[PDB]
Paper text:
Glutathione transferases (GSTs) constitute a superfamily of enzymes (EC 2.5.1.18) involved in the metabolism of endogenous and exogenous molecules, widely distributed in nature. They are bisubstratic enzymes mostly known for conjugating GSH to electrophilic molecules, thus increasing their hydrophilicity and facilitating their elimination from the body. Cytosolic GSTs are dimeric enzymes that bear a GSH-binding site (a conserved site known as the G-site) and a binding site for an often-hydrophobic cosubstrate (H-site), in each monomer. Our work shows for the first time that at least two cytosolic hGSTs from different classes, hGST M1-1 and hGST A4-4, catalyze the reaction between NO2-OA and GSH.
To overcome this pitfall, we prepared the GS-10-NO2-OA adduct by mixing a limiting concentration of 10-NO2-OA with excess GSH. hGST M1-1 was crystallized in the presence of the GS-10-NO2-OA adduct and the structure was solved at 2.55 Å resolution. With two dimers in the asymmetric unit, the refined structure displayed the typical features of hGST M1-1, including a conserved N-terminal thioredoxin-like domain (G-site) with typical βαβαββα topology and a C-terminal all-α domain (H-site). Indeed, the GS-10-NO2-OA adduct was bound within the active sites of the four chains within the asymmetric unit, all exhibiting the same binding pose. The electron density map suggested a (R,S) configuration for carbon 20 and carbon 31, respectively, in the four chains of the two homodimers. The glutathionyl portion of the adduct was strongly bound to the protein by many interactions, including several H-bonds and salt bridges, engaging residues Y7, W8, L13, W46, K50, N59, L60, Q72, S73, and D106' (from the other monomer, not shown in the figure). The OH group of Y7, a key residue for catalysis, was at H-bonding distance (3.0 Å) from the sulfur of GS-10-NO2-OA. The fatty acid portion comprising the carbon with the bound nitro group (carbon 31) and the methyl terminus sat in close proximity to the hydrophobic H-site containing nonpolar residues M109, M113, and F209. From the opposite side to Y7, another tyrosine (Y116, on the C-terminal tip of α4) established a 3.3 Å H-bond to one of the oxygens of the fatty acid nitro group. A higher mobility was observed for the carboxylate compared to the rest of the structure, as evidenced by a weaker electron density, as well as higher atomic displacement factors (or B factors). Finally, the crystal structure of hGST M1-1 also suggested that, as there is a fixed and conserved site for GSH binding and a very well-defined site to accommodate and interact with the nitro group, the enzyme can probably only bind and catalyze the reaction using the (E)-isomer of NO2-OA leading to the formation of the product with (R,S) configuration at the chiral carbons 20 and 31, that was observed herein.
Numbering used by the authors:
A (entry chain B), B (entry chain A): 2 to 218
The structure:
């Protein structure tokens, strides 16, 4: 069994958890609990942070035998390589590469306003730009069933996560993009994905850690 | 010829420029000049931002025939795929994947304190953590000639950019890590890399855009 180590939140591990479930990967989760305010005790993680053999210790981390991987996108790429979910044509690889980085940027942008204490002042400005960001995703997808082409790749798990987070934040934001709504439906309708969302292992909340102004609970 | 579009600064294009030079890639650069304070006029880019056919318009961008790529890591991966600089074994790919993301995180951390107006208050705290960060790179490299193994990969260009920026910021930071200094020497000693650094095309400064508190000039 692989070990997925991360906080007891959704955060950056959501797509890793979904990709593990979809690939029928045998795994165990090591969950770290963060303390409440004002200290936000990370001692549970910080004590074993340098005792795991990680090259650049960080959460999330995946231990799969001899391989100890950090960086959420690197963990996703590792799992996707085992089950051929990386794209085959050069066009597919370009789409995967762009999206892997683009979704990270969109997740960071949301996370920055959510972790800022002036979240209430920044929120309306973020909401004005949100339709423009979502429009790029709607357009890039187009008539395709999946984001890289006709086959599902790990970037579909990343795009789904960004779309789901924005629908948690602003529920009406996907209403203008029918193909984005259809993509969420198609992704959630996958047999393993559907089973995992009904199970007890499913952890859709909290969206961020206890230190966030939005999504801490 | 491929077209590399980016601001007239070093920024996120430094490793792309170096990788293009090392691979003997035929390319042209489209440089966008940002205006001075307080407006910081990005009209040169904003006018043709939606007229290039880019799926997710951004700087840097690479146009190579039918392929229009955005996201610096995606551009690097595209070029590296053409010249087999992505890693062959699974161990090498894991190293490349970790580093591609890890170097992006280190670049973002330096960029966040350099774009913050309280740069002078944040700088000493960032300098206390810097030895710990550099130690991880020194330990990950070990006795290897390159970061992924014995062969040079595109992540060596990314790591070099991170190390070089930190030595521009605090010059004595690499003195404690002899193998990191040796890596810089070995990377800069490559025939194409050495030739490009002596040429007029070389753009090592400004480190960041005009809006940055540090590295704007
Ligand atoms: C606020 C920072 C910018 C927005 C971040 C958006 C995503 C947030 C993530 C993260 C929360 C970040 C908190 C920032 C500081 C908040 C306090 C303030 O406000 O100063 S969780 C994972 C986080 N690891 C990474 O960030 C390594 C990311 C790497 N590229 C990857 O993808 O693996 C962690 O817990 N590390 C433990 C450790 O270092 O030992 N999450 O989901 O909670
Ligand atoms: C705010 C934290 C600091 C930014 C992170 C540090 C790296 C900086 C980069 C950047 C400068 C940004 C600085 C912002 C500052 C704000 C200030 C304030 O409003 O408060 S490159 C230029 C930038 N490109 C990206 O961001 C593409 C990133 C992508 N993940 C990749 O890897 O392609 C751009 O302009 N693109 C055209 C567009 O606008 O769409 N650089 O090297 O100059």
């Amino acid at each position: 069994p692989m070990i997925l180590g991360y906080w007891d939140i959704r955060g950056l591990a959501h797509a890793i958890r979904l990709l593990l479930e979809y690939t029928d990967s045998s795994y165990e989760e090591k969950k770290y609990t963060m303390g409440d305010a004002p200290d936000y005790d990370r001692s549970q993680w910080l004590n074993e942070k340098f005792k795991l053999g990680l090259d650049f210790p960080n959460l999330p981390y995946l231990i799969d035998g001899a391989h100890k991987i950090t960086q959420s996108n690197a963990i996703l790429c590792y799992i996707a390589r085992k089950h051929n979910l990386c794209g085959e044509t050069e066009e597919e690889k370009i789409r995967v590469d762009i999206l892997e980085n683009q979704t990270m940027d969109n997740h960071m942008q949301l996370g920055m306003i959510c972790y800022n204490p002036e979240f209430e002042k920044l929120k309306p400005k973020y909401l004005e730009e949100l339709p423009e960001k979502l429009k790029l995703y709607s357009e890039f997808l187009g008539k395709r069933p999946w984001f890289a082409g006709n086959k599902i790749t790990f970037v579909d798990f990343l795009v789904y996560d960004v779309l789901d987070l924005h629908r948690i934040f602003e529920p009406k934001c996907l209403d203008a993009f029918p193909n984005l709504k259809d993509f969420i439906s198609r992704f959630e309708g996958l047999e393993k994905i559907s089973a995992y969302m009904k199970s007890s292992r499913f952890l859709p909340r909290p969206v961020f850690s206890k230190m966030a102004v939005w999504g801490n609970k």
